[model samples]
Target chain A: NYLDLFSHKNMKLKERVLIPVKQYPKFNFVGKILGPQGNTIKRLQEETGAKISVLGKGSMRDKAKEEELRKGGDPKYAHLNMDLHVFIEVFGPPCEAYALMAHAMEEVKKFLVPDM
Target chain B: NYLDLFSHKNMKLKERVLIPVKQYPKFNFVGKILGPQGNTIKRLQEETGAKISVLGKGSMRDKAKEEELRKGGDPKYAHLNMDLHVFIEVFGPPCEAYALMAHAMEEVKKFLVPDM
Candidate 1:
């Protein structure tokens, strides 16, 4: 078994949430969400006090899947197409994480949602 | 500005979710959820292909709060008592993450919920 550096009992007080991209936008639009040199996400992180990550085409997850296939592991879901996903990890007091999540969602809507 | 290693464009297909602990259980009960040497969570991760973490009662969030107060950053919610939180990060195909989330929640109920 692999060494589990992050266990439930060993981690800090934190919570995480995922926001899915409803309709995949053009490649150029991805830049808008990323902002110039990723400044937009940086600001969101500071404002919400949460760690935000964007995942989609050609990310680490894709690399992992490639590695798995190379190893001949029968990754059951590897054949399916994946969508862009955003992860928010909130840290703070009891109610703080939820508050951060709410704020992060708003930022996501403002910056990423085309209709918004 | 701090470097943002995880931008929406730089990450791969991934998503995350939070499952808050309804009522804090006794100290001894935490062992049940953790299982022997965290075997339970390890199994969950393998079965669902999602990373699961538990937070509460002096986790990293607690440490961050203390550090913030020490720095005199008026952490508004620092005075509030925090509850336990669970974070699940799913990595894979689009629908796979949601499927994994459902399975992980079921495991959480079976292992962590006192009544279930």
Candidate 2:
């Protein structure tokens, strides 16, 4: 059951990603359901042992900032054009040590649709 | 005297550069104009107040290094796959103060072909 999470989302779920993370420095992990404002990331951190951070969409703020700067005003969101990077660290021993590589490869295989 | 050297070379001279230095880091300044093997660059340094360096094409070296590294052997040219940067500095005060921006603009205008 070799699974590529990205391809699975595209094929099985029919969800389209406007911007793919692999090409650029940032990506949005989309969701429809909102958990009580702040605890979603905290819960994921507890379960996966990985810490996470979120960024708000700020394109409108960026455009306003650009206009303000061009007119010699200091804009609040002056750094909007720059890319943001977030780090998430999960505590774990190497999965390859306990899990066989062949079994892992089989697990990945489960996500793909059969080619006609 | 408004001259865009890259476009000029393509139009009047019929010479093609496989890669543009602006797009990538490397460019071969073409010549039917090759001078005394090494003296040309030296003369340019003296005349134009600039310094220059050249790099040899090394795709062959990169491939050989990759093969060697794959076989658990040390590769001499292992870093050839990386980008190489060269610096050139031309010593001078700002061109416009002494000569004037209008004069510089005139010099540039001479190089452009008439727009049809």
Candidate 3:
């Protein structure tokens, strides 16, 4: 029924995204994604009506990765070879979850472009 | 009327995308977007139900670019500084135009990941 679309939001689909932080602006990739005081991410969640979180950070990944890089086990390959990192998770109504994640990341990308 | 959603496609919105070709795989950025013999592009048009085209190619862009690169007209900056090129135009109903461009590009991105 047409009403089915509404209920779909209650029991939703989830999308987990792993971004290669190394592929973007290196120094503050995590900060860029989270934004000042975590406001940018908060706005993305509010506007899309989705539950969004940068799970890895909410869960040292930056410190852990920083330490991992600092150890000098292999700097170039470590930076080059690793990162498919940055955990972003999204959950919401079926269609919007799909569109919203893309919509959110599309905006988040300005920082990745290295000019921001 | 509720019927408005259907007619929305008859005359609707358009998006022009400029992708940075150099950021992805070095060898065949354009080919990756278009796919084998253009089949991939045709598939994208069919699946998204939108009109999509690599505008620059339709207009010597690759050859001109190839020639430009061959001339050594600042190949490093040309390659580094150039892109924001690849012109992709999408036209369709409003919501789909937004969702579909993101959707199609999501698939197109596999080609950009370099392992592909």
Candidate 4:
């Protein structure tokens, strides 16, 4: 296991989002998010006053029901969401962290939702 | 080769920093710099108006670098530098990108120099 670089430095709430690396292998979403030796994320923390970090690579889900889930335009995305993922973590007071986490998610989803 | 996600979206100036991945493999300098699902880097872009991205791997250096550079407390760092690096690219107008790039380097070097 890798060191949890994003672990909260103080007693604060932690928020997380999981991104599938395999689902979009070619897109390099992680790379796009990382941005310029990491300028993008560093900026995120400074502006939000949130401690953040990206780590981990793995997953879990009900794969057998793949078709059923996709029928709702859900499985291929919501359910197919299992495995080989890079996770995002935000740390701070409950309200602040969640707000930051929500904001971060919107930015990330932009990449995923762009195809639609 | 991975797509140059950080490549200038416009014909803007580009500034770069080369991080040696192999030199500090276990230290996870990369992970710390990457912080929280990449919030750190993303925030960097928003604040500075610079485009940033981290990518690439491998290195180039003289093996004869053995003990020579180490003498000046240099080989282990300075000249011993070569290969398997994560490159930082900041793109924007000349003045802006360079300033951002310089700022970004200081932030990154923090992880490297803190040990001393």
- In order, what lDDT does every prediction score? 0.48, 0.29, 0.47, 0.45
Residue B104, candidate 4: alpha-carbon lDDT: 49
For residues B1-116, write the lDDT of model 3, one tens digit per residue. Answer: 01112234532333334443444435665666676677987887787666665543322345666565546766443432333333234565532344565575455444444454
CAPRI-style class, candidate 2:
incorrect
DockQ comparisons of all candidates to the true complex? 0.03, 0.01, 0.04, 0.01
Angstrom error at residue A38, model 1:
2.4
The estimated TM-scores of all candidates read 0.33, 0.21, 0.35, 0.29
Candidate 1 per-residue lDDT over residues B6-114, each given as its tens digit: 2343212222223333344343444555678889767777876667776544434357775566467456534323344455555543223333444555565454444
CAPRI verdict on model 1? incorrect
Off by over 4 Å in 4: A1-11, A58-86, A94-97, A111-116, B1-116
Give the alpha carbon lDDT tens digit for every residue of A56-96 in model 2.
23323365655566456346444344332222333232212
Worst-scoring 10-residue span by lDDT in model 3 chain A: A1-10
Candidate 3 vs candidate 4, lDDT winner: 3
Q: In model 1, how well does chain A match by TM-score?
A: 0.55
Per-candidate clash tally: 8, 17, 0, 35
- Every prediction's TM-score for the first chain? 0.55, 0.30, 0.49, 0.47
In the predicted model 3, the residue pairs found to clash are none
